[PDB]
Amino acid sequence: EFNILLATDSYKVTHYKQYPPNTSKVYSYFECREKKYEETVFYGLQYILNKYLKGKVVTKEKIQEAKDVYKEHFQDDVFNEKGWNYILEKYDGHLPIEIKAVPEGFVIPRGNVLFTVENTDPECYWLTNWIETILVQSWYPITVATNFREQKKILAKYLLETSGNLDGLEYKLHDFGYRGVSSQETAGIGASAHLVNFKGTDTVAGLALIKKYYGTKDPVPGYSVPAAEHSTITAWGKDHEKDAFEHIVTQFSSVPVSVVSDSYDIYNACEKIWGEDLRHLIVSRSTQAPLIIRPDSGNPLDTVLKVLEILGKKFPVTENSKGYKLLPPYLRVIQGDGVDINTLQEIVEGMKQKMWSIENIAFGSKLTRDLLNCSFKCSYVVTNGLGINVFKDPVADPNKRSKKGRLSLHRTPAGNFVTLEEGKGDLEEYGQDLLHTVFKNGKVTKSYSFDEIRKNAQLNIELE
């Protein structure tokens, strides 16, 4: 079972002894520090609060466990047993902490306060930064949500240009990343952040996370359809790729189905197998049950263009109202090899240059904490009853300078966001603080449904 006393950087175990004597408050904040990616989607704190921070997170057994582990880990007695026992005894193991945050799904420019943390009991001055490590992992859902939103902007631009509308945009970037992430827990979190932006996923772990921690009106937040993998083709033997294809499309004759076609020769598969031998099985399919051909190797742009060129000569192509070529409704393509934000752009731009509609294609999808510079810093403390504004400001890197004092987030006269420092929010010159109390003394005090998060994270173009 998870033990919050063992869920911090080791050195933080020793910090309670290092603050100035008589420190009663430590107040810290999280921002995506300013230096592409000018605005970030704030998403994922709610998961952390509920799974790890709320309720009785301290017990006698957990304190004894940490005591024993840290004795061996430090080869010495340094663990703050008394501090944790106090929280156990005084607050029945609930954390005397208050956290204020921007609403989940909000799109905010870099360099703004996203959330703040402070102790609500003077005895627990040391607790604010103990939980830095766990709260900072919010960088991941934030960065995933942000990066996927940036990809969606690109797809929307090109789909709108080549087709005149945004029909199907939310199914244009399917999550294929389950096997490529570092753990089961990460798969769930990352998939949930993808699903803020899209509705097609193969990462099943995302559905349960969303249902447990966020909630949707619909039974599930994400969908998929049947498809082959290389093993269901290659198992038939090298000479029987056609038999494989025929069997699979016949098994899934009235639902969409995607079939990886590059096991031996993508160009032959498209031109001769799909385009000639099995063509009669494809042109007979319903608009609701297209075959989606999947190339999966070679240069992604070159291969997509060649595949379209091949299919365009074997199948009846139309020209839509914007003048772009469109495959018949029972035939589409999906490319999931090598697709990052850069190549996605390259492919849609290249399709556009060859007069191919983005209607024809869908895509299948490492980010670090450094990408958006997600950082947690102490900005205000109270020692001997006097408040002081604190910050780092390293001489050799002005970009690492942190914010000073009590912080608040505000709407500007032009309707933008601004972060006020040094408690200046209290001057009431910028109206109300936009942060909301989301956690206080062991309880989640404000939360958001996945439907509302999705709404908050919409593109302007979707808002029309």
Ligand X SMILES: O=C(NCc1ccc(S(=O)(=O)c2cc(F)cc(F)c2)cc1)c1ccc2nccn2c1
Q: Annotated binding residues, as ranges?
A: 179, 202, 230, 294-296, 336-337, 369
Question: Are the C-beta atoms of residues 416 and 434 closer than 8 Å to each other?
Answer: no
Contact call for residue 230 and its own copies (CB under 8 A): yes
CB of 321 to its own copies, least distance (A): 30
Give me the DSSP letters along 357-373: -GGGEEEE----TTTTT
The pair of structure tokens assigned to 15 is 């910090």
Contact call for residue 265 and its own copies (CB under 8 A): yes
Give me the DSSP letters along 133-198: HHHHTTHHHHHHHHHHHHHHHHHHHHHHHHHSS-TTGGGSEEB--GGGSS-HHHHHHHHHHHHTT-
Residues 328-347 that bind ligand X (CB under 6 A): 334, 336
In the DSSP assignment, the letter for residue 461 is T
Interface residue with its own copies among 34, 55, 264, 277 (CB under 8 A) is: 264
Rounded Cα distance between 90 and 3, Å, is: 19
Contact call for residue 6 and ligand X (CB under 6 A): no
Interface residue with ligand X among 190, 221, 256, 300 (CB under 6 A) is: 256
Residues 172-191 that bind ligand X (CB under 6 A): 174, 176
Contact call for residue 280 and its own copies (CB under 8 A): no
The torsion defined by the Cα of 157, 158, 159 and 160, in degrees rounded to 10, comes to 50
Contact call for residue 61 and its own copies (CB under 8 A): no
Residues 141-180 that bind its own copies (CB under 8 A): 176, 178-180
CB contact set of 438 (below 8 Å; sequence gap of 6+):
45, 46, 49, 99, 100, 101, 115, 444, 445, 446, 447
Rounded Cα distance between 354 and 182, Å, is: 38
Contact call for residue 57 and its own copies (CB under 8 A): no
| DSSP H stretches of helix in 276-357 | 279-282, 300-314, 341-353
Which residue, 4 or 334, is less far from ligand X as judged by CB?
Answer: 334
CB of 447 to its own copies, least distance (A): 20
Contact call for residue 24 and its own copies (CB under 8 A): no
Angle between helices 205-213 and 184-195 (to 10 degrees): 70
Residue 176's closest CA among 294, 45, 299?
A: 294
Residues 393-432 that bind its own copies (CB under 8 A): 393-397, 400, 402
Residues 353-382 that bind ligand X (CB under 6 A): 362, 364
Which residue, 169 or 420, is less far from ligand X as judged by CB?
Answer: 169
CB contact set of 73 (below 8 Å; sequence gap of 6+):
10
Residues 325-344 that bind its own copies (CB under 8 A): none
SS3 of residue 275 by DSSP: helix
Residues 91-120 that bind its own copies (CB under 8 A): none
Q: Which residues are annotated as a binding site for beta-nicotinamide D-ribonucleotide?
A: 202, 294-296, 336-337, 369
Which residue, 197 or 303, is less far from its own copies as judged by CB?
Answer: 303
Tell me which of ligand X, its own copies, none is bound by residue 362, counting a contact when its beta carbon lies within the kind-specific cut-off of 5 to 8 angstroms.
ligand X
Contact call for residue 221 and ligand X (CB under 6 A): no
Residues 278-337 that bind ligand X (CB under 6 A): 292, 334, 336
Contact call for residue 259 and ligand X (CB under 6 A): no
**Which amino acid would we find at residue 273?**
I
Rounded Cα distance between 202 and 174, Å, is: 7
Which residue, 103 or 364, is less far from its own copies as judged by CB?
Answer: 364
Tell me which of its own copies, ligand X, none is bound by residue 222, counting a contact when its beta carbon lies within the kind-specific cut-off of 5 to 8 angstroms.
its own copies
Note the residues at the interface with ligand X (CB under 6 A).
9, 11, 171, 174, 176, 200, 202, 223-225, 227, 256, 258, 292, 334, 336, 362, 364
